[PDB]
Amino acid sequence: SKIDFVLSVAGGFVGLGNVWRFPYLCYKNGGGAFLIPYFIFLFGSGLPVFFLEIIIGQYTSEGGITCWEKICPLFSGIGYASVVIVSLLNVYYIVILAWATYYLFQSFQKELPWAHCNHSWNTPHCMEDTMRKNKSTNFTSPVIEFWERNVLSLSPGIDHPGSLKWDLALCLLLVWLVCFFCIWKGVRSTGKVVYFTATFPFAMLLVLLVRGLTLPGAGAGIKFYLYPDITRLEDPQVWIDAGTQIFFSYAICLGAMTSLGSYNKYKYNSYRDCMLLGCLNSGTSFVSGFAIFSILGFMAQEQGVDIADVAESGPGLAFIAYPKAVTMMPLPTFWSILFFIMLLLLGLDSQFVEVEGQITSLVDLYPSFLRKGYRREIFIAFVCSISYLLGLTMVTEGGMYVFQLFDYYAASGVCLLWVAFFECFVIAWIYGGDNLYDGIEDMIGYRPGPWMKYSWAVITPVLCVGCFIFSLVKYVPLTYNKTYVYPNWAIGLGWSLALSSMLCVPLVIVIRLCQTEGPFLVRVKYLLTPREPNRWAVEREGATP
Numbered sequence: 001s002k003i004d005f006v007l008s009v010a011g012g013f014v015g016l017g018n019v020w021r022f023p024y025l026c027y028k029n030g031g032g033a034f035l036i037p038y039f040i041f042l043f044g045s046g047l048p049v050f051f052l053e054i055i056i057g058q059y060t061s062e063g064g065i066t067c068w069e070k071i072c073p074l075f076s077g078i079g080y081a082s083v084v085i086v087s088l089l090n091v092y093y094i095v096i097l098a099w100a101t102y103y104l105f106q107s108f109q110k111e112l113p114w115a116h117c118n119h120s121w122n123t124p125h126c127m128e129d130t131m132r133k134n135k136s137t138n139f140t141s142p143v144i145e146f147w148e149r150n151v152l153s154l155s156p157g158i159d160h161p162g163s164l165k166w167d168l169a170l171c172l173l174l175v176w177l178v179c180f181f182c183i184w185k186g187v188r189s190t191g192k193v194v195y196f197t198a199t200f201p202f203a204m205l206l207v208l209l210v211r212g213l214t215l216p217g218a219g220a221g222i223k224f225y226l227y228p229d230i231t232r233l234e235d236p237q238v239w240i241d242a243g244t245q246i247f248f249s250y251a252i253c254l255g256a257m258t259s260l261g262s263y264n265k266y267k268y269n270s271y272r273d274c275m276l277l278g279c280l281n282s283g284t285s286f287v288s289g290f291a292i293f294s295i296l297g298f299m300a301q302e303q304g305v306d307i308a309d310v311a312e313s314g315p316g317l318a319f320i321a322y323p324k325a326v327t328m329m330p331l332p333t334f335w336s337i338l339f340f341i342m343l344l345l346l347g348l349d350s351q352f353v354e355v356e357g358q359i360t361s362l363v364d365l366y367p368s369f370l371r372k373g374y375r376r377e378i379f380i381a382f383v384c385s386i387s388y389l390l391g392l393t394m395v396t397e398g399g400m401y402v403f404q405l406f407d408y409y410a411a412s413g414v415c416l417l418w419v420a421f422f423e424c425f426v427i428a429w430i431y432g433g434d435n436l437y438d439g440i441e442d443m444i445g446y447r448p449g450p451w452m453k454y455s456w457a458v459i460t461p462v463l464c465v466g467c468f469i470f471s472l473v474k475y476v477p478l479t480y481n482k483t484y485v486y487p488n489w490a491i492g493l494g495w496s497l498a499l500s501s502m503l504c505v506p507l508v509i510v511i512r513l514c515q516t517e518g519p520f521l522v523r524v525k526y527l528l529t530p531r532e533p534n535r536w537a538v539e540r541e542g543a544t545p
């Protein structure tokens with residue numbers, strides 16, 4: 001049937017990129033004007049690049065970096081670019097789990113601290129959500145006050161780091177301690193039975209979806225979610241966010257799908273897997289968007305404010321809407337523990353794979369010094385120790401702004417499109433899209449349609465290049481919560497994170513040509529020759545020509 005096939009592919013597609021990132025990127029970019037580029041990218045580059053990464057991984061049986069070594073010795077810097085991207089992602093991504101751990105710890109009491117605002121951290125302008133319309137014109141919300149004046153202690157700006165938050169600092173250590181021990185002891189990403197680690201996130205989502213859709217104001221929120229705005233489409237930013245939100249959700253361009261695809265058998269039909277997993281992953285984001293955008297509709301009518309100004313147009317919308325949802329449920333404390341355990345579980349499985357993803361890449365990149373044993377065990381703590389130290393800048397009072405810089409630049413925006421464009425440029429144009437099908441029809445048993453070939457050859461390069469050009473022409477600098485303008489150096493620092501990964505592609509190109517000897521035309525030609533991509537003879541595998 002189909003349930004066994006769904007059980008076969010497990011439930012690792014859903015992550016924090018679906019329940020935390022997509023809700024606020026859609027919220028930041030107006031309403032439904034995010035969905036049009038979202039689906040355009042999903043069906044033009046998202047699924048095509050995802051299947052391309054999986055099919056290369058299973059074609060070469062090689063990880064993130066060595067796969068490019070086999071496919072095209074030139075442009076091999078895509079692996080190192082993916083390594084830098086995943087390193088910065090690991091640095092700033094566990095901060096979300098630190099926030100989730102802090103929320104979970106604070107939820108272990110009789111009364112949820114963010115239900116009412118009568119505590120020390122609350123601004124005198126706070127008013128209860130019910131009392132805002134039941135009876136200094138701007139009145140802030142008790143949920144927002146907990147997030148900004150307790151969890152974040154937001155400082156006037158990124159130029160005011162303030163004092164390190166010790167309560168958050170320990171929480172950032174605990175998740176790294178959890179991540180350190182699990183990776184070092186070889187613990188599987190999903191613990192014991194995978195059923196609980198997979199069905200529980202869905203079970204809580206339907207609980208939140210049912211509550212959200214039943215809320216009195218949910219009608220307005222869904223209209224905001226779905227009905228698009230043509231004017232917002234002219235902005236090149238919404239195409240940057242939607243294009244890379246697909247890439248973030250699918251964990252492509254990170255070198256993780258290629259490693260995941262390397263374990264598939266040569267005669268395995270991954271095409272149905274990628275199509276199913278892609279639709280399930282994006283289908284969750286669209287469906288879970290209904291849950292969170294229904295709460296905002298209820299929140300907006302409760303406070304008598306616009307939907308676009310009811311919450312934070314940045315990270316922490318899932319830490320503002322979802323904690324608000326669990327407050328309007330029977331036994332609110334019980335659901336808050338469950339949601340933030342689900343939120344913690346979803347991040348941990350993603351972080352276990354990615355941190356081990358680079359650690360496996362890093363040790364294999366530099367052997368003879370990272371031997372499996374006393375050398376690897378100290379290395380695992382080394383990566384975690386350094387990633388914890390760089391992650392400590394996002395724990396300070398002004399750490400929220402640094403987190404937004406990393407979210408916008410480190411593993412999103414132009415850096416992700418830079419890798420995705422070069423993956424499709426090498427395969428479709430240098431290697432040849434037709435040459436890849438000759439492998440695929442041998443591999444999955446049947447040659448696919450012309451969708452994939454006409455997506456790597458034209459659609460993805462046009463989408464990636466077109467977004468990059470118009471973002472530079474209509475350059476709008478990054479802002480946090482649509483009211484804070486970043487200092488010029490901060491954008492320069494943010495661009496360095498994007499440039500550090502992007503510069504890997506041209507730098508390795510220079511390195512390879514200088515290393516090789518001979519005529520330049522022969523030199524570049526030699527580095528463009530695939531080193532027997534599928535050299536495996538263990539399985540009934542045909543030769544590349």
Ligand SMILES: CC(C)CCC[C@@H](C)[C@H]1CC[C@H]2[C@@H]3CC=C4C[C@@H](O)CC[C@]4(C)[C@H]3CC[C@]12C
Pocket residue numbers: 158159160161487488489492
């Ligand atoms: C590209 C250049 C010209 C931009 C302008 C930089 C100049 C104006 C200098 C003057 C004062 C400087 C700031 C002084 C103190 C700190 C606190 C530290 O924790 C982070 C850097 C930060 C925030 C500095 C950033 C750079 C800064 C703003």
Ligand SMILES: CCCCCCCCCCCC
Pocket residue numbers: 429430431528529
């Ligand atoms: C539009 C980009 C064209 C790039 C041409 C690459 C040709 C690859 C030849 C490989 C010979 C082994």
Ligand SMILES: CCCCCCCCCCCC
Pocket residue numbers: 080084500501503504507508511
């Ligand atoms: C031959 C491999 C060279 C890879 C270089 C990676 C550069 C990463 C850091 C970018 C500048 C800080």
Ligand SMILES: CCCCCCCCCCCC
Pocket residue numbers: 520
């Ligand atoms: C040492 C390198 C000498 C060659 C420099 C590049 C020449 C490129 C010519 C391209 C003609 C199509």
Ligand SMILES: CCCCCCCCCC
Pocket residue numbers: 043449451
């Ligand atoms: C909008 C859906 C686009 C699908 C293109 C054709 C699919 C062929 C079979 C996967």
Ligand SMILES: CCCCCCCCCC
Pocket residue numbers: 491492493495496
């Ligand atoms: C390393 C942080 C400072 C870098 C400033 C120069 C880079 C500007 C990129 C646009």
Ligand SMILES: CCCCCCCC
Pocket residue numbers: 080083084087500
């Ligand atoms: C091989 C890349 C390791 C991490 C480099 C990070 C540079 C900012």
Ligand SMILES: CCCCCCCC
Pocket residue numbers: 102105106108109167
């Ligand atoms: C009475 C408050 C209990 C909070 C426990 C966890 C603190 C991070």
Ligand SMILES: CCCCCCCC
Pocket residue numbers: 472473475488
């Ligand atoms: C037309 C693009 C202008 C960008 C200016 C950026 C200065 C920090």
Ligand SMILES: CCCCCCCC
Pocket residue numbers: 488489491492495
């Ligand atoms: C390569 C893009 C240029 C951005 C300039 C930003 C300067 C702070």
Ligand SMILES: CCCCCC
Pocket residue numbers: 035036039040043
């Ligand atoms: C609503 C946009 C759809 C794009 C093609 C699937």
Ligand SMILES: CCCCCC
Pocket residue numbers: 040043044451454
């Ligand atoms: C925009 C998606 C196109 C898929 C069919 C060529």
Ligand SMILES: CCCCCC
Pocket residue numbers: 207210211214329330
């Ligand atoms: C529909 C009433 C119950 C709300 C929580 C699911």
Ligand SMILES: CCCCCC
Pocket residue numbers: 213214
């Ligand atoms: C109060 C019931 C509303 C149902 C909306 C799906």
Ligand SMILES: CCCCCC
Pocket residue numbers: 032035036226227228
């Ligand atoms: C792309 C979403 C369309 C919803 C109905 C206009």
Ligand SMILES: CCCCCC
Pocket residue numbers: 202205206209280283284287288
């Ligand atoms: C929250 C429901 C998820 C459904 C994915 C197909």
